[PDB]
Amino acid sequence: NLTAAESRIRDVDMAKEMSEFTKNNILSQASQAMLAQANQQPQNVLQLLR
Amino acid sequence: NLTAAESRIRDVDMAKEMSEFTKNNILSQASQAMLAQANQQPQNVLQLLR
Amino acid sequence: NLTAAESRIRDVDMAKEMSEFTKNNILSQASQAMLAQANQQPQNVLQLLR
Amino acid sequence: INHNIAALNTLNRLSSNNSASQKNMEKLSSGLRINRAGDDAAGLAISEK
Amino acid sequence: INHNIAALNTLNRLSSNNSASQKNMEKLSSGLRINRAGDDAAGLAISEK
Amino acid sequence: INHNIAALNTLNRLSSNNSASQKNMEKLSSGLRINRAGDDAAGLAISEK
Amino acid sequence: MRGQIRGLEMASKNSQDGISLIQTAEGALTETHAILQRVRELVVQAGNTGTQDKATDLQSIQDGISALTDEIDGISNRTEFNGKKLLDGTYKVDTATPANQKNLVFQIGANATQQISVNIEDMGADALGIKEADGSIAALHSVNDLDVTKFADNAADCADIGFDAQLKVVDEAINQVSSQRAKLGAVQNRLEHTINNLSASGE
Amino acid sequence: MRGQIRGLEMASKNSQDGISLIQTAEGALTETHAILQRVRELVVQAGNTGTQDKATDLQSIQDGISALTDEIDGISNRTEFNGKKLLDGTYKVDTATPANQ
Amino acid sequence: DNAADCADIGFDAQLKVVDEAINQVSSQRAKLGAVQNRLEHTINNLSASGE
Amino acid sequence: QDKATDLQSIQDGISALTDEIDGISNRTEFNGKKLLDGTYKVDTATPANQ
């Protein structure tokens, strides 16, 4: 019962944490794509206002 | 008769309980496969909306 | 009684130790999968910030 | 809404199923349909008596 | 204002997300929902005891 | 929580059952319902007398 | 929403912790109970086999029983959760005194006042709770084990040692374990259904 | 047009929010129901197994049931949406009184 | 000492402090964003009118 | 279930968070104007102090 109690403290919902891991990968990658786009827009500006 | 009475209280339908055990294994595994799929769909989304 | 005493000192809970063995295999493999992922993320970064 | 989807109802079923199979074992291993817990403390207290 | 635009809120989300996925791994790899850090030092000190 | 599950109640039943069958043998082999141990030292000390 | 979500995550945490406490005390009381089965075996033998056992035989038995007492007391004085002696029989003696209860509260709900009130009262000295411990009878047969030689004097004749009272102490001690575990498992079921709600509602 | 378009966007928003309320109360009532299944199990046992159970046994059961009551009340008094206790049984008792609905 | 018994520390008041603190942040940000929208539409007017 | 020390560990964390909130409200300046000075524009029902 005591190791179970500990296990509740250290309970990893491994499915949750893999899922959340997945999500955070997705979110990182998406945000970086948008950072690229943030660097693309002012180049378009550069040409258009040259 | 008394140990039989107790046995009725503690009656394990061992066949039932092995069967139900089996089922719950199946159900756990199936649900986890679906959790994987729940993590797969938004990745497809990530690519498709990149 | 004496060989039993020794046996208590050298008592292997063989079921425990097979179980713990199993667990430690699982844990090693999982951790290595995560090390792969640790090597995957910065590659995603490389492309995304190219 | 990618970051919000995890099929959390599936996850809830997962927790349920894991506890379910666990209970099955515990009864199988112990040979006890009775609970350790007071669930059906009537039948328990009877078998105690 | 080209030199002033970097979607810095996106960059902040980036830092956040990288640390987030990192934390997920660390717990996954270690099999520990508990933190190494004192965040929830209550639950930690309990499990220590 | 894979590293925390071993059906330890099953393991406890295992230890119990192994000792149980052991005791059965010991009595069967020796032909003694009496214990070597002082468990029921009343009946033992009687049979001694 | 997030305030409540996060509160439900910590609610699930707190309720699982509740369960850990429960099952700790539960298994301890199961072992206590198993002892009490052995005790009653030793009570029926401590019918002296009538008169056939001698005073020394009753003392051998009584040595075994006092040993068992020391084990029951060991249960009730070793079963701790986070230091809290969960089988401190004086933990939550209601007493009709609110000031002295240590109410085993479990705050679960993310909303205020959503608490569970639980009661601990069992221990080795807690056997026939007539109202409290009576004296040599009703509690201290569980502690002191009146079947020494006083039993051989009056195996039935006076109820106080006449086998009757002793067996009643054991029977009620068991019944108090039964009801303690009944409450305990009632709360177990509560937290089961609570968690199921916390999971679905949280989702 | 745009007035209606924008109103339809906020309409979709409001309806999805409706759904969120619904599914909240829904899952709560599903759990309530599951309890009630357990209750009826305890009713059939609280046939006393006829007469075989004793008064203490019925009290053990009743402790379990009152515990379940406290859980049902917990459902109906914890299921909130934006503070609105969605399973407040006195929320919309029609009453034949429009003033109190 | 009093996990619920007196409201002052009985978990109730504390959670209410947090809840209202949040609500005050919510309303502060509500005013703040109201003015944000104002200046959005202001600038749109200033731009069109200026033109 | 938590003990007094556990509540103190939590409280250490919370007082730390307080110090961070105070840090927000006492670092958020615009042109020196502590924009989250909670006493900046307390209406008070006193025009003189706003």
Author numbering:
A (entry chain M), B (entry chain A), C (entry chain C): 255 to 304
D (entry chain A), E (entry chain M), F (entry chain J): 3 to 51
G (entry chain W): 52 to 254
H (entry chain g): 52 to 152
I (entry chain s): 204 to 254
J (entry chain s): 103 to 152
Structure paper excerpt:
While the three L-type mutants (E115G, S285P, and S17P) have a left-handed 11-start helix, the four R-type mutants (N226Y, A233V, H84R and A39VN133H) have a right-handed 11-start helix, and the designations L and R correspond to the hand of these 11-start helices. The L-type 11-start helices are tilted left by ~ 1.7° and the R-type 11-start helices are tilted right by ~ 3.9°. In R-type subunits of B. subtilis, the side chain of E115 in S0 forms two conserved hydrogen bonds with the side chain of N240 in subunit S+5. These two sites (E115G and N240) are mostly conserved among different bacterial species, and we also detected the same interaction in the R-type A443V mutant in P. aeruginosa. In the B. subtilis E115G mutant, the filaments lose this conserved R-type interaction and therefore formed a left-handed filament.
